CSV table of C-alpha atoms and ligand atoms in Angstrom, one decimal:
chain,number,residue,atom,x,y,z
A,1,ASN,CA,-11.8,26.0,-2.4
A,2,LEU,CA,-10.7,27.1,-5.9
A,3,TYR,CA,-7.7,24.6,-6.1
A,4,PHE,CA,-9.2,21.5,-4.4
A,5,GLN,CA,-9.0,18.3,-6.6
A,6,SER,CA,-11.7,15.8,-5.5
A,7,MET,CA,-9.9,12.8,-7.1
A,8,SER,CA,-6.4,13.5,-5.7
A,9,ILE,CA,-5.4,11.3,-2.8
A,10,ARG,CA,-3.1,14.1,-1.5
A,11,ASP,CA,-5.8,16.8,-1.5
A,12,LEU,CA,-8.4,14.4,0.0
A,13,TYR,CA,-5.9,13.4,2.8
A,14,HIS,CA,-5.2,17.0,3.9
A,15,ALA,CA,-8.9,18.0,3.8
A,16,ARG,CA,-10.0,15.3,6.3
A,17,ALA,CA,-10.3,16.5,9.9
A,18,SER,CA,-11.2,13.0,11.2
A,19,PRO,CA,-9.1,9.8,10.8
A,20,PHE,CA,-9.8,7.2,8.1
A,21,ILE,CA,-8.7,4.0,6.2
A,22,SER,CA,-7.8,2.8,2.7
A,23,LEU,CA,-8.1,-0.7,1.2
A,24,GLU,CA,-5.8,-2.8,-1.1
A,25,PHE,CA,-7.4,-5.6,-3.3
A,26,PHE,CA,-5.9,-8.0,-5.9
A,27,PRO,CA,-7.5,-9.2,-9.3
A,28,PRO,CA,-9.0,-12.7,-9.0
A,29,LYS,CA,-8.0,-15.3,-11.6
A,30,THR,CA,-11.6,-16.1,-12.7
A,31,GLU,CA,-14.6,-14.1,-13.9
A,32,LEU,CA,-16.8,-15.6,-11.2
A,33,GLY,CA,-14.1,-14.6,-8.6
A,34,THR,CA,-14.2,-11.1,-10.0
A,35,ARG,CA,-18.0,-10.8,-9.8
A,36,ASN,CA,-17.8,-11.9,-6.1
A,37,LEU,CA,-15.0,-9.5,-5.3
A,38,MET,CA,-17.1,-6.5,-6.7
A,39,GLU,CA,-20.0,-7.5,-4.3
A,40,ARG,CA,-17.5,-7.5,-1.4
A,41,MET,CA,-16.0,-4.1,-2.4
A,42,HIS,CA,-19.5,-2.7,-2.5
A,43,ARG,CA,-20.1,-3.9,1.1
A,44,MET,CA,-16.8,-2.5,2.3
A,45,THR,CA,-17.6,1.1,1.0
A,46,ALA,CA,-19.7,1.3,4.2
A,47,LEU,CA,-16.3,1.5,6.1
A,48,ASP,CA,-15.8,4.9,4.3
A,49,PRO,CA,-12.4,4.3,2.7
A,50,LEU,CA,-10.6,7.4,1.4
A,51,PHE,CA,-9.5,5.3,-1.7
A,52,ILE,CA,-9.2,1.7,-2.9
A,53,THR,CA,-6.1,0.2,-4.7
A,54,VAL,CA,-5.6,-2.7,-7.2
A,55,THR,CA,-2.3,-4.7,-7.3
A,56,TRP,CA,-0.2,-5.3,-10.5
A,57,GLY,CA,1.8,-8.4,-11.3
A,58,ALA,CA,5.6,-7.8,-11.8
A,59,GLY,CA,6.6,-7.8,-15.5
A,60,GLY,CA,3.0,-7.2,-16.7
A,61,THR,CA,1.7,-10.7,-15.8
A,62,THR,CA,-1.8,-9.3,-14.7
A,63,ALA,CA,-1.9,-6.2,-16.9
A,64,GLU,CA,-5.4,-6.8,-18.5
A,65,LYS,CA,-7.0,-8.1,-15.3
A,66,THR,CA,-5.6,-5.2,-13.2
A,67,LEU,CA,-6.6,-2.5,-15.8
A,68,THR,CA,-10.1,-3.9,-16.2
A,69,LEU,CA,-10.8,-4.2,-12.4
A,70,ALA,CA,-9.4,-0.8,-11.5
A,71,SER,CA,-11.6,0.9,-14.3
A,72,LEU,CA,-14.7,-1.1,-13.3
A,73,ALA,CA,-14.3,-0.2,-9.6
A,74,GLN,CA,-13.8,3.5,-10.4
A,75,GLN,CA,-16.9,3.6,-12.6
A,76,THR,CA,-19.3,1.8,-10.2
A,77,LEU,CA,-18.2,2.3,-6.6
A,78,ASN,CA,-17.9,6.2,-6.6
A,79,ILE,CA,-14.6,6.1,-4.8
A,80,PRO,CA,-11.1,7.1,-6.0
A,81,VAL,CA,-9.1,4.1,-7.3
A,82,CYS,CA,-5.3,3.9,-7.2
A,83,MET,CA,-3.8,1.4,-9.7
A,84,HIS,CA,-0.4,-0.2,-8.8
A,85,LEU,CA,2.2,-0.2,-11.6
A,86,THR,CA,5.7,-1.9,-11.6
A,87,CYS,CA,8.3,-0.8,-14.2
A,88,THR,CA,11.2,-3.3,-14.6
A,89,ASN,CA,11.5,-6.0,-17.2
A,90,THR,CA,8.6,-4.5,-19.3
A,91,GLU,CA,8.5,-2.8,-22.7
A,92,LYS,CA,7.9,0.9,-22.6
A,93,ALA,CA,4.8,0.4,-24.9
A,94,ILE,CA,3.1,-1.6,-22.1
A,95,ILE,CA,3.7,1.1,-19.5
A,96,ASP,CA,2.4,3.8,-22.0
A,97,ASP,CA,-0.8,1.8,-22.8
A,98,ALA,CA,-1.5,1.3,-19.0
A,99,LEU,CA,-1.2,5.0,-18.2
A,100,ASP,CA,-3.3,6.0,-21.3
A,101,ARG,CA,-6.1,3.6,-20.4
A,102,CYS,CA,-6.1,4.7,-16.7
A,103,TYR,CA,-6.3,8.4,-17.8
A,104,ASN,CA,-9.2,7.7,-20.2
A,105,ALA,CA,-11.1,5.7,-17.5
A,106,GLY,CA,-10.9,8.6,-15.0
A,107,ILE,CA,-8.2,7.0,-12.8
A,108,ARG,CA,-6.1,9.8,-11.3
A,109,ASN,CA,-3.8,8.0,-8.8
A,110,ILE,CA,-0.9,5.5,-9.5
A,111,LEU,CA,1.3,3.6,-6.9
A,112,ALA,CA,4.7,3.7,-8.8
A,113,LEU,CA,6.8,0.6,-8.0
A,114,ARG,CA,10.0,-1.1,-9.1
A,115,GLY,CA,8.8,-4.7,-9.0
A,116,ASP,CA,11.7,-7.2,-9.3
A,117,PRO,CA,15.3,-6.4,-10.0
A,118,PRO,CA,16.1,-5.7,-13.6
A,119,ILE,CA,17.2,-8.6,-15.7
A,120,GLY,CA,17.5,-9.2,-19.5
A,121,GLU,CA,18.0,-12.0,-22.0
A,122,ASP,CA,21.9,-12.2,-21.6
A,123,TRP,CA,23.7,-12.2,-25.0
A,124,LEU,CA,20.3,-11.8,-26.8
A,125,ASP,CA,20.4,-8.2,-25.5
A,131,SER,CA,14.2,-2.9,-20.3
A,132,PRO,CA,14.8,0.8,-19.7
A,133,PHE,CA,13.4,1.3,-16.2
A,134,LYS,CA,15.7,0.1,-13.3
A,135,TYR,CA,14.3,1.7,-10.1
A,136,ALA,CA,10.9,3.0,-8.9
A,137,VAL,CA,12.2,6.6,-9.2
A,138,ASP,CA,12.6,6.1,-13.0
A,139,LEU,CA,8.8,5.5,-13.2
A,140,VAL,CA,7.9,8.5,-10.9
A,141,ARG,CA,10.0,10.8,-13.1
A,142,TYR,CA,8.4,9.3,-16.3
A,143,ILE,CA,4.8,9.7,-15.1
A,144,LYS,CA,5.4,13.3,-14.0
A,145,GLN,CA,7.1,14.1,-17.4
A,146,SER,CA,4.2,12.6,-19.4
A,147,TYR,CA,1.2,13.7,-17.3
A,148,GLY,CA,2.2,16.4,-14.7
A,149,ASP,CA,-0.3,16.4,-11.9
A,150,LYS,CA,-3.0,14.6,-13.9
A,151,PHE,CA,-1.7,11.6,-11.8
A,152,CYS,CA,-1.2,11.8,-8.0
A,153,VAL,CA,1.8,9.3,-7.6
A,154,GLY,CA,2.4,7.2,-4.5
A,155,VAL,CA,5.5,5.1,-3.6
A,156,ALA,CA,6.6,2.3,-1.3
A,157,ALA,CA,8.6,2.6,2.0
A,158,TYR,CA,10.3,0.1,4.4
A,159,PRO,CA,10.4,0.9,8.2
A,160,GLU,CA,12.6,-2.2,8.8
A,161,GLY,CA,14.5,-2.0,5.5
A,162,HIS,CA,14.0,-3.6,2.0
A,163,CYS,CA,15.3,-7.2,1.5
A,164,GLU,CA,15.9,-8.7,-2.0
A,165,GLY,CA,14.4,-12.2,-2.6
A,172,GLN,CA,18.1,-5.0,6.0
A,173,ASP,CA,19.0,-1.4,6.4
A,174,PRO,CA,16.2,1.2,6.9
A,175,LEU,CA,18.6,4.1,6.7
A,176,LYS,CA,19.8,3.0,3.3
A,177,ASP,CA,16.2,2.9,2.0
A,178,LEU,CA,15.5,6.4,3.5
A,179,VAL,CA,18.1,7.8,1.1
A,180,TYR,CA,16.3,6.2,-1.9
A,181,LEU,CA,12.9,7.3,-0.5
A,182,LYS,CA,14.1,10.9,-0.5
A,183,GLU,CA,15.0,10.7,-4.2
A,184,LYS,CA,11.5,9.4,-5.0
A,185,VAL,CA,9.9,12.3,-3.1
A,186,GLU,CA,12.2,14.9,-4.8
A,187,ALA,CA,11.2,13.4,-8.2
A,188,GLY,CA,7.5,14.2,-7.4
A,189,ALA,CA,5.9,11.5,-5.2
A,190,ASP,CA,2.7,12.8,-3.5
A,191,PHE,CA,2.2,10.1,-0.9
A,192,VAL,CA,3.9,7.1,0.7
A,193,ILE,CA,2.6,3.6,1.8
A,194,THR,CA,4.7,1.3,4.1
A,195,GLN,CA,5.4,-2.5,4.0
A,196,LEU,CA,3.4,-4.3,6.7
A,197,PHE,CA,4.8,-4.2,10.3
A,198,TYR,CA,3.8,-5.5,13.8
A,199,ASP,CA,6.4,-3.5,15.9
A,200,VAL,CA,4.9,-0.1,16.5
A,201,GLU,CA,8.3,1.3,17.6
A,202,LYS,CA,9.9,0.5,14.2
A,203,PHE,CA,7.2,2.5,12.5
A,204,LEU,CA,7.5,5.4,14.9
A,205,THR,CA,11.3,5.7,14.6
A,206,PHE,CA,10.9,5.6,10.8
A,207,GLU,CA,8.1,8.3,10.9
A,208,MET,CA,10.4,10.6,13.0
A,209,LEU,CA,13.3,10.2,10.5
A,210,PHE,CA,10.8,10.8,7.6
A,211,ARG,CA,9.7,14.1,9.1
A,212,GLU,CA,13.2,15.4,9.9
A,213,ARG,CA,14.9,14.3,6.6
A,214,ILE,CA,12.2,14.2,3.9
A,215,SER,CA,9.0,16.1,4.5
A,216,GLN,CA,7.1,17.6,7.5
A,217,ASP,CA,3.7,17.4,5.7
A,218,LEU,CA,3.7,14.6,3.0
A,219,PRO,CA,1.0,12.0,3.6
A,220,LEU,CA,2.5,8.8,5.0
A,221,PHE,CA,0.2,5.7,5.4
A,222,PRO,CA,1.2,2.7,7.6
A,223,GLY,CA,0.4,-0.6,5.8
A,224,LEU,CA,-1.4,-3.1,8.1
A,225,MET,CA,-2.0,-6.8,7.8
A,226,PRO,CA,-4.8,-8.3,9.9
A,227,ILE,CA,-4.3,-11.5,11.9
A,228,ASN,CA,-6.6,-14.0,10.1
A,229,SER,CA,-5.1,-17.1,11.8
A,230,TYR,CA,-2.0,-17.8,13.9
A,231,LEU,CA,-0.2,-19.6,11.0
A,232,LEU,CA,-1.2,-16.9,8.4
A,233,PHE,CA,0.1,-14.1,10.8
A,234,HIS,CA,3.5,-15.8,11.1
A,235,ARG,CA,3.7,-16.4,7.3
A,236,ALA,CA,3.0,-12.7,6.5
A,237,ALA,CA,5.7,-11.6,8.9
A,238,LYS,CA,8.2,-14.2,7.3
A,239,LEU,CA,7.5,-13.1,3.7
A,240,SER,CA,7.7,-9.3,4.5
A,241,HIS,CA,10.8,-9.7,6.8
A,242,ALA,CA,8.8,-7.9,9.5
A,243,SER,CA,9.7,-8.6,13.2
A,244,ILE,CA,7.0,-9.7,15.8
A,245,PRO,CA,7.8,-8.2,19.2
A,246,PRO,CA,7.9,-10.4,22.3
A,247,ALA,CA,5.0,-8.4,23.9
A,248,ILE,CA,2.7,-9.4,20.9
A,249,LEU,CA,3.9,-13.1,20.9
A,250,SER,CA,3.1,-13.4,24.6
A,251,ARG,CA,-0.6,-12.6,23.8
A,252,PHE,CA,-0.7,-16.0,22.0
A,253,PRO,CA,0.4,-18.7,24.5
A,254,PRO,CA,-0.1,-22.4,23.4
A,255,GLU,CA,-3.6,-22.7,24.8
A,256,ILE,CA,-4.6,-19.7,22.6
A,257,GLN,CA,-2.7,-20.8,19.5
A,258,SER,CA,-4.8,-24.0,19.4
A,259,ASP,CA,-8.1,-22.0,19.4
A,260,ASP,CA,-8.7,-20.3,16.1
A,261,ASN,CA,-11.6,-18.2,17.3
A,262,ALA,CA,-9.5,-16.8,20.3
A,263,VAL,CA,-6.6,-16.1,17.9
A,264,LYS,CA,-8.9,-14.0,15.6
A,265,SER,CA,-10.5,-12.1,18.5
A,266,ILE,CA,-7.1,-11.2,20.1
A,267,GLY,CA,-5.8,-10.3,16.6
A,268,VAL,CA,-8.6,-7.7,16.2
A,269,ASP,CA,-7.5,-6.2,19.6
A,270,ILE,CA,-3.8,-6.1,18.5
A,271,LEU,CA,-4.7,-4.1,15.3
A,272,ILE,CA,-6.9,-1.7,17.2
A,273,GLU,CA,-4.2,-1.1,19.8
A,274,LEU,CA,-1.6,-0.5,17.0
A,275,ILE,CA,-3.7,2.0,15.2
A,276,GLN,CA,-4.6,3.9,18.5
A,277,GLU,CA,-0.9,4.1,19.6
A,278,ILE,CA,0.2,5.4,16.2
A,279,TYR,CA,-2.5,8.2,16.1
A,280,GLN,CA,-1.7,9.3,19.7
A,281,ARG,CA,2.1,9.1,19.6
A,282,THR,CA,2.2,11.1,16.4
A,283,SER,CA,-0.2,13.8,17.7
A,284,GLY,CA,-2.6,13.0,14.8
A,285,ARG,CA,0.0,13.5,12.0
A,286,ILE,CA,-0.7,9.9,11.0
A,287,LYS,CA,-4.5,10.0,10.4
A,288,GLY,CA,-4.8,7.4,7.5
A,289,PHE,CA,-4.4,3.6,7.9
A,290,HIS,CA,-3.9,1.4,4.8
A,291,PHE,CA,-5.1,-2.3,5.0
A,292,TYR,CA,-3.8,-5.3,3.0
A,293,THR,CA,-7.2,-7.0,2.6
A,294,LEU,CA,-6.1,-10.1,0.6
A,295,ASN,CA,-9.8,-9.8,-0.6
A,296,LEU,CA,-11.3,-10.6,2.8
A,297,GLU,CA,-13.7,-8.3,4.8
A,298,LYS,CA,-14.5,-9.7,8.2
A,299,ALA,CA,-11.4,-8.8,10.4
A,300,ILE,CA,-11.2,-5.3,8.9
A,301,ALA,CA,-14.9,-4.6,9.5
A,302,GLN,CA,-14.4,-5.6,13.2
A,303,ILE,CA,-11.2,-3.5,13.6
A,304,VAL,CA,-13.1,-0.4,12.2
A,305,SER,CA,-16.4,-1.0,14.2
A,306,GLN,CA,-14.8,-1.9,17.5
A,307,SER,CA,-12.2,0.9,17.5
B,1,FAD,C1,2.3,-0.6,-0.5
B,1,FAD,C2,3.0,-1.6,-1.4
B,1,FAD,C3,2.4,-2.1,-2.6
B,1,FAD,C4,3.1,-3.0,-3.4
B,1,FAD,N1,2.4,-3.5,-4.5
B,1,FAD,C5,3.1,-4.3,-5.4
B,1,FAD,C6,2.4,-4.9,-6.6
B,1,FAD,O1,1.2,-4.5,-6.9
B,1,FAD,N2,3.1,-5.7,-7.4
B,1,FAD,C7,4.4,-6.1,-7.1
B,1,FAD,O2,5.0,-6.9,-7.9
B,1,FAD,N3,5.1,-5.6,-6.0
B,1,FAD,C8,4.5,-4.8,-5.1
B,1,FAD,N4,5.1,-4.3,-4.0
B,1,FAD,C9,6.5,-4.7,-3.7
B,1,FAD,C10,7.6,-4.0,-4.4
B,1,FAD,O3,7.5,-4.1,-5.8
B,1,FAD,C11,8.9,-4.7,-3.9
B,1,FAD,O4,9.2,-4.4,-2.5
B,1,FAD,C12,10.2,-4.3,-4.8
B,1,FAD,O5,11.2,-5.2,-4.5
B,1,FAD,C13,10.8,-2.9,-4.5
B,1,FAD,O6,9.9,-1.9,-5.0
B,1,FAD,P1,10.1,-0.4,-4.7
B,1,FAD,O7,9.2,0.4,-5.6
B,1,FAD,O8,10.1,-0.1,-3.2
B,1,FAD,O9,11.6,-0.2,-5.3
B,1,FAD,P2,12.7,1.0,-5.1
B,1,FAD,O10,12.3,2.2,-4.3
B,1,FAD,O11,13.2,1.2,-6.5
B,1,FAD,O12,13.9,0.3,-4.2
B,1,FAD,C14,14.2,-1.1,-4.3
B,1,FAD,C15,15.7,-1.3,-4.2
B,1,FAD,O13,16.3,-0.8,-5.4
B,1,FAD,C16,17.6,-0.3,-5.0
B,1,FAD,N5,17.6,1.1,-5.4
B,1,FAD,C17,16.5,1.9,-5.5
B,1,FAD,N6,16.9,3.2,-5.9
B,1,FAD,C18,18.2,3.2,-6.0
B,1,FAD,C19,19.2,4.1,-6.4
B,1,FAD,N7,18.8,5.4,-6.7
B,1,FAD,N8,20.5,3.7,-6.4
B,1,FAD,C20,20.9,2.5,-6.2
B,1,FAD,N9,20.0,1.5,-5.8
B,1,FAD,C21,18.7,1.8,-5.7
B,1,FAD,C22,17.8,-0.5,-3.6
B,1,FAD,O14,18.6,-1.6,-3.3
B,1,FAD,C23,16.4,-0.6,-3.0
B,1,FAD,O15,16.3,-1.4,-1.8
B,1,FAD,C24,4.5,-3.4,-3.1
B,1,FAD,C25,5.1,-2.8,-2.0
B,1,FAD,C26,4.4,-2.0,-1.1
B,1,FAD,C27,5.1,-1.4,0.1
């Protein structure tokens, strides 16, 4: 009781007896779009998310919009907010300003990311090179005042695939002080489960690990998400969408809800409840996620 931190994603995760979700949002490009998203976020608090996240454009391209939205959400929603933060190709002063502003706004969680590969200005010659460089820097500068998350790849990272290679780098990130891990999206439950077994044996028996999940909002959008993330779609899932279903968008969406429910239930059962938190890539949409949560 004495040591519990009510704003820490790690402490909140372990304290839960029952399973739960988290939600990732992005900053809209207009003020009207931002007002509308805040209304949507307010409605989605009825799904009882453990925390919400706000994405960050590589190289600082959305710095002001991300910082503003994360702070506004933290102040008004009464839910912990985790701000994403990429480190390559950005001046140290921008990273320092972002962390200072988060700290002063009451934000106590950061998802520490590389972003794109490092690159300079050739002969005109950027001190962060990998995500681990940012994890170490945050912990040096703030200790446990920030609970720090990092990214993982059950099917391996691909530059714009070897999951064992990335497990080596993931271990370095955890040893440097990462407090939780969120995965790239996947549709093959067995790729996630083999990864989770390797994570427990080689990295940590207890660290919070969230599968990242992308709803199926149309047949074409589903295929596009898998293409961009380099995630495989198993034959057993593809067979649920024969041509007569593919042509019927309402049927695709309904079957898509069932596939996500089944994925979640299989993970919870097969891991004996070790995996009790499920992270959704919302793309600022509510309906599919509300059905997945209400029908489960
Ligand atoms: C949950 C989640 C949220 C995300 N949010 C965003 C976002 O808001 N904005 C955005 O731009 N991107 C985001 N990304 C994408 C991410 O920035 C890219 O996948 C990026 O290419 C790698 O980031 P990382 O932090 O996993 O990098 P790292 O863990 O640094 O690894 C990336 C690669 O760097 C190399 N590497 C790492 N460490 C070492 C080492 N010690 N020695 C040698 N080589 C090494 C490896 O080749 C490795 O595959 C997100 C990803 C996830 C899973």
